[PDB]
Nucleic acid binder design. Structure first.
Ligand SMILES: [Zn+2]
Ligand SMILES: [Zn+2]
Ligand SMILES: [Zn+2]
Length: 87
DNA sequence: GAGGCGTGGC
DNA sequence: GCCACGCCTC
């Protein structure tokens, strides 16, 4: 019934979900179980979604398509910042 | 562009 | 726990 708060002296951040805290706790430890298998990259991550996002950098996966223009991006926030140039 | 990070619906 | 959205920082 407790709210997920970090119990490391210095921290104290509280999160809404336990999974949020589990990701944060991996910052105190060095745990990054999600590795990038790309040739020569070596990047590792503590959250799965970050590896997915990072991986598009290697695959060229650009799902977010600018409809005024013909430039695409691998991330939603990348495109949103591009539309400002199309105001 | 890319990584760190907080959040929420499922 | 997954996955995606969105913001912050460099
Ligand atoms: Zn902490
Ligand atoms: Zn990689
Ligand atoms: Zn465009």
């Amino acid at each position: 019934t407790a709210t997920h708060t970090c119990d490391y002296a210095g921290c104290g951040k509280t999160y809404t979900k336990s999974s949020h805290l589990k990701a944060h706790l991996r910052t105190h430890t060095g745990e990054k179980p999600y590795h990038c298998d790309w040739d020569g990259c070596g990047w590792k991550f503590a959250r799965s979604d970050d590896l997915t996002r990072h991986y598009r950098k290697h695959t060229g996966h650009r799902p977010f398509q600018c409809q005024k223009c013909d430039r695409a991006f691998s991330r939603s926030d990348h495109l949103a910042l591009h539309m400002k140039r199309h105001f």
